[PDB]
């Protein structure tokens, strides 16, 4: 019974920091990279689309350009880790990691962003 | 390039009526029912989970119990049609049909529900 799991369903991160959001999927010893599809989104925004052992940045939402990456090292360990660099207040929301690997499933992850006045003020007027 | 498509991304339905929400996926001549995964949800509520040629009502959200069904006749024609009977105001929302069939994709469908005063009054006072 194919299941994606999340060690943490909540992340509290500081504006300006890097975060790694993780989800696990069952890998039995050896990864079948051909069959693997990893897809990250927040609300409805495409972050990552890993298919046929390669990311597809053509479909990636502009706000996550050059600052969103899948950690391919961890994929062998059944960990689809999404790193977001330079976290903004816009990154606060519900993420979804959708994985297909024989079966298919997804999990939700809530991200809260703490920001000082200055950063908040700018986001407020936007 | 595996793609789910929706003829209509918006449905306006009357309280008390039945609705059929549709998604298409490419079927090349013959359906491989073993590989097919169809999954319907509305705002994170599980409606349908079709896998290994069979629905799984164990994970189905209670509000869609006995009144939500996948049209299996149309699956061979690459049409994952979700029928909801006796539409309520609670059914208004964003639906997602997630399909895995070799590749994987999903589409969003917005449903609006028109209801008379009486039905609205009852929904208003949850
Ligand atoms: C068979 O069960 C499912 C199946 C699919 C499911 C079905 C079909 C396709 C895809 C999928 C795969 C990759 C993609 C993609 C879509 O579109 C493009 C990007 O790459 C998924 Cl994912 C989805 C869900 C479930 C069931 N889960 C288990 C409980 C519940 C859950 O975990 N909720 C979240 C809790 O935080 C729903
Ligand atoms: Cl996590
Ligand atoms: Cl439709």
How many domains is chain B partitioned into structurally?
1
Q: How was this structure determined?
A: X-ray
**Does B48 sit in the ligand 1 pocket, CB within 6 Å?**
no
Distance between CA atoms of B93 and B111, rounded to whole angstroms?
5
Q: Which stretches of B6-102 are assigned E, i.e. beta strand? A: 10-14, 19-21, 37-42, 45-51, 54-55, 68-71, 81-84, 93-101
Tell me if B91 sits within 8 A of B113, measured CB to CB. Answer: yes
Phi first, then psi, for residue A75 (nearest 5°) are: -60, -35
Tell me if A21 sits within 8 A of A11, measured CB to CB. Answer: yes
**Does B49 sit in the ligand 1 pocket, CB within 6 Å?**
yes
Distance between CA atoms of A39 and A49, rounded to whole angstroms?
5
Tell me if B38 sits within 8 A of B101, measured CB to CB. Answer: no
CB contact (8 A) between residue A104 and residue B100: yes
Looking at the CA of B111, name the nearest ligand: 3
**Strand B54-55, strand B68-71: pairing:** unpaired
**Does A39 sit in the ligand 1 pocket, CB within 6 Å?**
yes
Distance (Å) from CA B112 to ligand 3 centroid: 13
Q: Which of B23, B61, B100, B101 gets mutated to test ligand 1 (max ligand atoms within 8 A of its CB)?
A: B100
Q: Resolution of the deposited coordinates, in angstroms?
A: 2.2
Structural domain including A38 reads 1-124
Distance between CA atoms of B48 and B60, rounded to whole angstroms?
6
Residues at Cβ < 5 Å from ligand 2 ion: A 6-8, 22
Distance between CA atoms of A47 and A16, rounded to whole angstroms?
18
In degrees, rounded to 5, the angle at the alpha carbon of residue B38 between the alpha carbons of residues B32 and B43 is 170
CB contact (8 A) between residue A104 and residue B104: yes
Biggest CA-to-CA distance, chain A: 50
The DSSP bridge partners found for residue A107 are A97
CATH number, residue A99 = 2.60.40.10
Write the residue in B103, B104, B108 that is nearest to A44 by C-beta. B108
Q: How far is B6 from chain A (nearest CA, A)?
A: 16
Looking at the CA of A82, name the nearest ligand: 2
Alpha helices in chain B (DSSP H): 117-124
Residues of B in contact with A104 (CB under 8 A): 37, 39, 98, 100, 104
Q: How far is A121 from chain B (nearest CA, A)?
A: 31
């Amino acid at each position: 019974a194919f299941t994606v799991t999340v060690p943490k369903d909540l992340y509290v991160v500081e504006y300006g920091s890097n975060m790694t959001i993780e989800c696990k999927f069952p890998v039995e010893k050896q990864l079948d990279l051909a069959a693997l599809i990893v897809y990250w989104e927040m609300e409805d925004k495409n972050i990552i689309q890993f298919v046929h052992g390669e990311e597809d940045l053509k479909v990636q939402h502009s706000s996550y350009r050059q600052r969103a990456r899948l950690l391919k090292d961890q994929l062998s360990l059944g960990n689809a880790a999404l790193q977001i660099t330079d976290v903004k207040l816009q990154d606060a929301g519900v993420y979804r990691c959708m994985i297909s690997y024989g079966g298919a499933d997804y999990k939700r992850i809530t991200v809260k962003v703490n920001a000082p006045y200055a950063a908040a003020l700018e986001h407020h007027h936007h």
